[PDB]
Design goal:
Two copies of one chain form a homodimer.
Chain A: E1 4-12, E2 15-22, E3 25-29, E4 31-33, H1 46-51, E5 57-60, H2 61-66, H3 70-75, H4 79-83, E6 89-92, H5 95-98, E7 104-106, E8 109-111, H6 116-126, E9 130-132, H7 144-166, H8 169-174, E10 176-181, H9 187-200, E11 204-207, H10 216-226, E12 236-238, H11 244-251, E13 257-259, H12 262-268, E14 271-272, E15 279-280, H13 300-304, H14 307-315, H15 319-345, H16 349-360
Parallel strand pairs in A: 4-13, 5-6, 6-9, 9-10, 10-11, 11-12, 12-13
Antiparallel strand pairs in A: 1-2, 2-3, 7-8, 14-15
Helix pairs in contact in A: 6-7, 7-9, 12-15, 14-15, 15-16
The complex binds 2,6-diamino-3H-quinazolin-4-one (DQU) (2 copies) and zinc ion (2 copies).
PDB class: transferase
Keywords: Transferase
Assembly: dimeric
């Protein structure tokens, strides 16, 4: 197995489908990564996450460096062994979630000391497969001046991240490193950022700084010009996106990888994704509904339990309600990704996207 | 399959091992029943409860009549279909948990109107396999006068329960009815109660009114004289017991069936049962312990995850921690029951009980 090989099997417009081969497994793209914040995808055993179709999960340099600790996890054999997930793990770099749960920022990093060097080292200690460069995210809205400052600092930090990763042989040989494009909503800054990142060279390229309050039309407008700026032959990762319709439109714009807490977090709060749009299972109208969460869904939850039962569990505060809702929503997201992949392979993704939107809305 | 057939395969002292055959499955005895209060064994899918070795689970006329409602569950197809457990379910009668979460008691029942007739009807609506007579539990300590009054009322209610069950053909043909001995800690009242219940006739006989604050020596003293009073050829159910050592000693005294919330409830609070006694996984000493919860346990949790990981999850408030702890503890209890059954079958239970106690303590 190679350290890293991204291959594109089929294309339609700007959409692509293919594979990322890594030492710990193959990632089918476009890919959705369930988020495992504190070394768990909330309310799911790893075998259940896998059974839903996930090829890779996300972790975070922030939560884990705080609890249980990066050195501790390394002593215990690494994150994979610790949590019982033996396939690829992408780790975020930790900037984003510092500025989460008395920040002091400087050119050296953030204290709260998380620098580019320490972030890459933590991700090493965790045994991450896909390491994210340490960046500064840029709040929305941002003035051009502030967006430029943040983007420029992130590009200096992208070079520091590259060099920290490459200087550590076991990491450089076994893991991959992704860079993160910044620039807010501004085309010229997005272009400077893409060019800086391509000059350094990375295994993949994330679009950072979106899904921070701008809303879908604007996100899509920025993706329209931003994704083409990135090297075509490397994966394109849209960080922190998103809703099902966000994912479809982002794939239409050349994104290959996604993560978001919506299916887990919103699942525990009672929101179930269906092909006919989201439902909130707490609604009284579900109290005697014997149908599954979604009429077509192949997941184990929909094979076995009714809306009425899940309604009762969520109303009652029961753990099994969180478990069932989360499994269904992660399974739904993976079925979406499978339908996206298949439709691109068959040259009918544009039609799939049309049909999906007509019915989901 | 018969409605009900209890067979004793092997005996040692007062201990017995055998089977209860019912329409929905066979129950191996001595049996431990996980408790499923609000139509769920907390933090476990039913398939997981089964995989641990459980043959039967417990539900409760109280919680379910309140939420989601007995008539509602019947409309939805019964408790088995609702929660996805297709094997036997024993339901408690609801008295106990009323006097749980402005009570008005009378000879007719309790208002808060739960009468013997309504309790048996609710258990019908739920589709219970083993229906408990509606009783009055008697607080501990109890004066002889108050214990006698409560016991006498419970025996009048036991006859009302019998007659309500028998007058409903589908229930009488497909379910079983257990009576509940009362009398507090008093031998003469226990004898009157046993005699009253045997005169009415039941499919099984519970020992009620224990594990309410008296402590193990006293419980065992009362079991010593109380269990022999019950018909030998019917199951003996000790309600709400107990800790592993409580179970062993109760089997030594002729009990065949058990339920308790300890493995579920205490599991979510961090207590793990092991052959070397309970541990509290929240203790800092487990933060880097790579051993499984218990060194011999065959459960899936112990095959896959470390104390260190479960420690982290419970400290972090994570749902997966509750899931793992609960699975392990229910699996532990079922392995205890299997070792009890096998040792009685092989004529070496007294030695097993010795050995168990030496090491657990
Ligand atoms: N919307 C997102 C989510 C995660 C991110 N993480 C990093 N490191 N940088 C960003 O821009 C992110 C944006
Ligand atoms: N310790 C227990 C637990 C459950 C009981 N339920 C009923 N109906 N009656 C009792 O005496 C109980 C005692
Ligand atoms: Zn589903
Ligand atoms: Zn175990």
């Amino acid at each position: 197995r190679p350290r890293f090989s991204f291959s594109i099997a089929a294309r339609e417009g700007k959409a692509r489908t293919g594979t990322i081969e890594m030492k710990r497994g193959v990632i089918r793209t476009p890919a959705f990564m369930p988020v495992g914040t504190a070394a768990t995808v909330k309310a799911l055993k790893p075998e259940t996450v896998r059974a839903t179709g996930a090829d890779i999960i996300l972790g975070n340099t922030y939560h884990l460096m705080l609890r249980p600790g990066a050195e501790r996890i390394a002593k215990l054999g690494g994150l994979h062994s610790f949590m019982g997930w033996d396939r690829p793990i992408l780790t975020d770099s930790g900037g984003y979630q510092v500025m989460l749960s008395l920040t002091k920022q400087s050119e050296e990093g953030v204290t709260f000391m998380l620098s580019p060097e320490r972030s890459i080292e933590i991700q090493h200690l965790l045994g991450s497969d896909i390491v994210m460069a340490f960046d500064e995210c840029t709040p929305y809205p941002a003035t051009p001046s502030r967006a430029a400052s943040s983007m420029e600092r992130s590009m200096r930090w992208a070079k520091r991240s590259r060099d920290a990763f490459d200087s550590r042989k076991e990491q450089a040989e076994n893991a991959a490193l992704f860079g993160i494009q910044q620039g807010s909503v501004f085309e010229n800054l997005r272009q400077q950022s893409a060019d800086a990142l391509a000059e350094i060279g990375f295994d993949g390229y994330a679009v950072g700084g979106l899904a921070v309050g701008e809303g879908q039309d604007e996100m899509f407008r920025v993706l329209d010009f931003s994704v083409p700026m990135l090297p075509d032959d490397k994966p394109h990762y849209l960080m922190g996106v998103g809703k099902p319709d966000d994912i479809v439109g982002a794939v239409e714009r050349g994104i290959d990888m996604f993560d978001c807490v919506l299916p887990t977090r919103s699942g525990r709060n009672g929101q179930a994704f269906t092909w006919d749009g989201p439902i909130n299972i707490r609604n009284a109208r579900f109290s005697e509904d014997l149908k599954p969460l979604d009429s077509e869904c192949h997941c184990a939850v929909c094979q076995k339990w009714s809306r009425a039962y899940i309604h009762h569990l969520i109303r009652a505060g029961e753990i099994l309600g969180a478990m069932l809702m989360t499994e269904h929503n992660i399974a739904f997201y993976q079925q979406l990704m499978q339908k996206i992949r298949d439709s691109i392979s068959e040259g009918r993704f544009s039609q799939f996207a049309q049909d999906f939107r007509a019915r989901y809305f």
